[PDB]
Design a protein around this ligand. Structure first.
Ligand SMILES: Cc1ncc(C[n+]2c([C@@H](O)CCC(=O)O)sc(CCOP(=O)(O)OP(=O)(O)O)c2C)c(N)n1
Ligand SMILES: Cc1ncc(C[n+]2c([C@@H](O)CCC(=O)O)sc(CCOP(=O)(O)OP(=O)(O)O)c2C)c(N)n1
Ligand SMILES: Cc1ncc(C[n+]2c([C@@H](O)CCC(=O)O)sc(CCOP(=O)(O)OP(=O)(O)O)c2C)c(N)n1
Ligand SMILES: Cc1ncc(C[n+]2c([C@@H](O)CCC(=O)O)sc(CCOP(=O)(O)OP(=O)(O)O)c2C)c(N)n1
Ligand SMILES: [Mg+2]
Ligand SMILES: [Mg+2]
Ligand SMILES: [Mg+2]
Lengths: 556, 556, 556
């Protein structure tokens, strides 16, 4: 009657069940109460194990792994505030669809609400942000293993997207030699242990039907808006929009190649919006649109119908247009609603976008963050991936650069948090095995500073650009009041990142001009290690350059 | 600007939006805070309005209406315990899939938690039981009508099954002359007001893929179990199982024609269960299986695979078998997995089912509830429908009768409450316009006694049989302790229902023999009115007859 | 190792624990899953057991018992919608403070969300309305009895007011002979089984401190508003306000004797409100004020300070005055803040109130509901109690009658539901053993009609007056729209209650004049039984009479 042994048999059923749904990566933070889960995971040869000491960073690491691999990723944490630190990544996964399976160890019910150490009320603590929530009961042999495996199989099988909170209480003793307690209990599952399928297969698909009046609407004056999607989906959307003869507005997160680049500029020109007013239908594929001018135009346009195609559920139009919400894999939906060659109807916008790109190129020389964003395509690693941070970097790349079609971009643009970008980038890199360029701001790098520990383990060179503009200079772009701006918005920390890099034995460069930045990159791509490149720029130059380019393109 | 007028335009957008998703029936209870909703509904010509003073019965009325019409049915109640009385019907709909749209008037936020009369905390008060929960904000023109209609359209469009809780706060004044306040706000919706589709079309379908190994499994020794489903699905399932040569165990709710009747009896015979041990796959269509012996066999059986096909989501096997949970329209699923003619493999069970039926036929003469259940087909109205109550009646009919294939049966077998059976039957009748036979126990009739008011308005004859065995005699069938049984289980109320019928001006019969029962029926089918037939039987005769028949068939 | 016997030991600990906190009354509805609780209660000699088949009426019966006895009252229900039917009485308990302990049987965790019959998600289903919620775990001897009893003792000891939800899962088998399973487990509590105290005494008192500036505020022009309170508290508040010389506005629920009667009438006079504008402080004792003119004056008045003294927590002023919210026993609070002799400062209001009462007396002769309310003091049983229903009756009694000081008045005026007035009145009666006068409207009587079953067992004569004006004529009182009024507001049911009384074998009178009403009362007070007195009055006479008296008193 060993309680510790049965705890580990119970946990073993949980972990093995996860392996039947494609869970390969598991992220583990240290703890005692989580011993059954952690030991079950450590003995299971199906898993790739990642570890970290910061549970918030651990959640974001799993988020990067799931983001890139598109598979579900498991997380194990002990009870207490460890569980609470998983909330940010769980919320982001709830918005962008990553499947995070959170195995959160818990105290047994008899140690809740009685002043016990490290014991908190854990069931339901993530409210509505998980797609599925499971509060497992106190382990007992009187509950059959087929129930437990069926519960996990239901949770994973019906998971369209988002996280699953599985709260796992365990009573002490937690340690001891394994005996035969729970062995026959496990063996009631028969040769399921030697199988590769779930015990219960419940995998219904959620998908919109094909639109039968599509061959009617494809004949009208349409606009294609491309948001976040996969790289191949970006290429397919570009070819499809070109065949329809519809203008393609491509987000930085779309890998379209942006045939009409610098939309965040030329959408501010009245000639562009006036021409767009002729559109009778807008077909948007993907969501989480980046550029402000694009969100303003989306809010202002009044086509007869507005369609949003995406594999995310729920409403995705923040302007609440009359139209359609269509849940589908974008590539499959494009096969279901194919294009037919038709003459382009736009005449003024292509010239406007060409002139906008020219206006940016004329200002490429100064050694600032706006020029860095504009020139970032010259620095993308061959056969690599781009992880773009939040705040100004993603806005400037979206507004000022033309990224190549099908070159993968990853981001945390659900909630756009600055709290997990380094640990997320580590997961992005570890998932794909590709050389990675990640670009973040100074406050973002400080926020997840300890994630530099994770970046000591990458499988290919990862360049982390930290743009140091001494604060959150997006609040120099926003019309924040000047008298409170410094103390309450920008919050400069007056630091550099050479000692942070030295602390974790990472190569570091602080280039002062373009030649030295190119030298730094040429060095950094030579080894499967993380190199930190700090670009020190004058605080408000990027914001002001963006404003000036906006005005200049508006008078075209 | 007029607050009362704008409140009514806000409500009018809500109700009009509901009409774009098939909402036709609307159930209304009286109140003051619900005035914007109730007046908007009264002015909208798309609705059939039903009224009732008991909100618990009003919810069950909406439940029966939705049950029969297969469309979402709306409910309007004022704030306070009126909302709370909707909980039972909402729970049952959450289990069996009826789409109840609950429009619950509320006090505005400034009158919550301050001692205001009839003001309670309403958002989230139904916990996880609604499929969707919408807590509308305090009405204001600063929120566009397109947002409101889009929120409703998202909720109804993605509603696969179950209830939607829409909390609707309204601030006073509620009354006053209608002026043009909010007219422009409404007109931002354009010609949507003259349209017949939603403002936002968001209607993804949830369905399992085709099982690609079905051509293997169809040739193995299978068993077909038919649970609750529609009448036409019942006929298709019967034909499908017959073609496969698999034994069909048909529930009273399956309308399959029950080709192996009295399963609750012959499943107690060791030769049957021994023959079923040879089954390699069980394919169950529908759920909420009725009989105790059937649930025990399901719990004990160990096929290689156990499948449950149904249009309800989630796990439906209370024994957690290894197998599959397939979400589909059953007719579509049968076409997707067609049968191929193979010879039947069962030898002993058909004979056992015939002999069991004969054993019931031998005891048909006594004027008791077991005989009424066994003989109930002789009282089914032509082109009518059967509504069967809970406790002993559904068990005795399931065990003792063979109901004709395709003859519609309705019930409340999700949670199996005895709290709303009369009002549910009233909704069933009003939705179909068909002559109805409804059968309930005495405690069930007392529980929903005031629903006799609703049964003063039927569009076709409805016979209500109240089996009066003086208490809940299911607790004479279960091995309840003898010393506490009467006071704490049976709870006989020692009443008759003649004065209940007279209070609501309903025809009444208390037949003493079969001939007088026939006479009561013949009188009852002649006009579109409700006739109450009270059948007085000795308390434990039906339970004992069931026990004796179980033993006798077990010794065959 | 008997699961059934241990279920009953676990339950026996729960019920015995409740007896240490003053739980004497227990209300039990029938079921199978509730067997451990029901048998534990049936075997425990500390309890008085009440039974009922309608769980909503069972909740209101417990509500009335707790209302009168000021003890916590326990309720046992089976799993499923039975649990949901307790919601209205629980909400009312959350508003007015009755201590209801809801013991709700549940299926064990392995039968949740898997299609099992009568199994729903019960933990948290009452949202925020219980003061304390306990989700008991699956019973096991690995959890010590001292944990179980300590958790119950914590919930009951810290219960200031309101309901407690104790969810109690039990796995089958539920029946079987008691053996020694769980005996030593129970015996770990030692001689606590022979004790009269809780295992854990945790009973912190919640109370506001003495107001140090009260001797300052006693000398200002104050008004005393008396809301709902106990009978003794009403008498003390009357003497206190008289000693201060402050006008006492006394609610129908205050039992103050209403020295300025017909406040709902004379508060409509400009001289009264103009005089009251001189008030620099208002001290309200109790809450849930009844009358519309009183609520309007509270909303409009702007004293320097507004105090509400009550033993209920939270804000109790729906008008949000600047001031104090003082939590205390009213009698204790009067002793901490005693009155000093001061000269009344009001001159116009006493005369106005005498004139209003005279104006009502001038209209006492017609045989209508307004006149019944005005004259109701002539029918109060000696040493008895009054239970006043909702809608017009409580408003007409409040506006037109002067009830004697200290004569007990009971009501359901938290949420003011019409859904449990009969069963509540039965509990009010059984708790005190006093002769009871209960007055309700026709829709109220229909709503809780089956509670007439409960009224077959009263310990003293109870007169139930049903005022039948054929609908909810309070909506003839409010300015509802004329063409929708009857169908969507009044909803007349066109019934009488002679057959309802006859069905439950209750004496019935339908008096046609004051003499026959007198005779009916004399007949009713002779035996400890319920007599139903139906007063048929013309639909709008009571409402209209009130409006006329309001206009006339407003113009004095
Ligand atoms: C946010 C969160 N997440 C995880 C833990 C777990 N947890 C601990 C217990 O407090 C508890 C065990 C347990 O029950 O799991 S201690 C501990 C290690 C601390 O390492 P250190 O700073 O180098 O100090 P040292 O161990 O003395 O060398 C962890 C990692 C936690 N407490 N809080
Ligand atoms: C976890 C969390 N908490 C706070 C924020 C807010 N927030 C931002 C928007 O999101 C701002 C809109 C908004 O806040 O409504 S941006 C921003 C500054 C980032 O500074 P940086 O890295 O130095 O880069 P820079 O701006 O380019 O110079 C902050 C701090 C956040 N995103 N996530
Ligand atoms: C609203 C609610 N609350 C309680 C129950 C429980 N419950 C039953 C099971 O359904 C459940 C068992 C169980 O307790 O496990 S049956 C039953 C008695 C039925 O009395 P009847 O109408 O005269 O019919 P008869 O028994 O054939 O004579 C009760 C009272 C319920 N179902 N619904
Ligand atoms: C459970 C629930 N659901 C609905 C309501 C709404 N509601 C009322 C509240 O607005 C008034 C509460 C009060 O303040 O007294 S009053 C009322 C009509 C009652 O008709 P009646 O018994 O014939 O008496 P009469 O009006 O004097 O003729 C209704 C149907 C409710 N209170 N509770
Ligand atoms: Mg910065
Ligand atoms: Mg019965
Ligand atoms: Mg009335």
């Amino acid at each position: 009657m060993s309680v510790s042994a049965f705890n580990r048999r119970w946990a073993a059923v949980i972990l093995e069940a996860l392996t039947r749904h494609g869970v390969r990566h598991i992220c583990i933070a240290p703890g005692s109460r989580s011993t059954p889960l952690t030991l079950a995971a450590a003995e299971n040869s199906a898993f790739i194990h990642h570890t970290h000491f910061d549970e918030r960073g651990l959640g974001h690491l799993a988020l990067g792994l799931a983001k890139v691999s598109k598979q579900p990723v498991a997380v194990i944490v002990t009870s207490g505030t460890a569980v609470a630190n998983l909330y940010p990544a769980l919320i982001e996964a709830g918005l962008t669809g990553e499947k995070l399976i959170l195995l959160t160890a818990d105290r047994p019910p008899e140690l809740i609400d009685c002043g016990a150490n490290q014991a908190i009320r854990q069931p339901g603590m993530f409210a509505s942000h998980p797609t599925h929530s499971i509060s497992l009961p106190r382990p007992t042999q009187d509950i059959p293993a087929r129930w437990l495996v069926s519960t996990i199989d239901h949770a994973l099988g019906t998971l369209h997207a988002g996280g699953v909170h599985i709260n796992c209480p365990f009573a002490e003793p937690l340690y001891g030699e394994m005996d035969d307690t729970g062995l026959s209990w496990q063996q009631r599952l028969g040769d399921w242990w030697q199988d590769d399928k779930p015990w219960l297969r419940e995998a219904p698909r959620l998908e919109s039907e094909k639109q039968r009046d599509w061959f009617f609407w494809r004949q009208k004056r349409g606009v294609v808006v491309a948001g976040r999607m996969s790289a191949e989906e970006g290429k397919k959307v570009a070819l499809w929009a070109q065949t329809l003869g519809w203008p393609l507005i491509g987000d930085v997160l779309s890998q379209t190649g942006q045939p009409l680049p610098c939309a965040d500029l030329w959408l501010g020109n009245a000639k562009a919006t006036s021409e767009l007013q002729q559109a009778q239908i807008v077909v948007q594929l993907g969501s989480s649109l980046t550029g402000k001018r694009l969100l303003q135009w989306q809010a202002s346009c009044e086509p007869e119908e507005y369609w949003i195609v995406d594999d995310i559920e729920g409403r995705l139009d923040p302007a609440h247009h009359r139209g359609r919400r269509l849940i589908a894999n974008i590539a499959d939906w494009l096969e279901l609603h194919p294009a037919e060659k038709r003459q382009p109807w736009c005449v003024e916008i292509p010239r406007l976008a060409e002139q906008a790109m020219q206006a940016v190129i004329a200002r490429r020389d100064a050694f600032g963050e706006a020029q860095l964003a504009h020139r970032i395509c010259d620095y993308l690693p061959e056969q690599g991936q781009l992880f773009v941070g939040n705040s100004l970097v993603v806005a400037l790349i979206d507004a000022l650069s033309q990224l190549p079609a099908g070159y993968p971009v990853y981001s945390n643009r659900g909630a756009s948090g600055i709290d997990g970008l380094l640990s997320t980038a580590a997961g992005v890199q570890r998932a794909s095995g590709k050389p990675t360029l990640a670009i973040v701001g100074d406050l973002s790098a400080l926020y997840d500073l300890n994630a530099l520990a994770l970046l000591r383990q990458v499988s290919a060179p990862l360049v982390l650009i930290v743009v140091n503009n001494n604060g959150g200079q997006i609040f120099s772009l926003l019309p924040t009041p000047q008298s409170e701006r410094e103390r309450f918005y920008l919050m400069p920390q007056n630091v550099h990142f050479e000692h942070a890099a030295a602390m974790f034995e990472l190569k570091y460069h602080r280039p002062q001009n373009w030649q030295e930045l190119e030298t730094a990159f040429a060095d950094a791509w030579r080894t499967p290690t993380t190199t930190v490149i700090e670009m020190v720029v004058n605080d408000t130059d990027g914001a002001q350059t963006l404003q000036q380019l906006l005005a200049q393109v508006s008078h075209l």
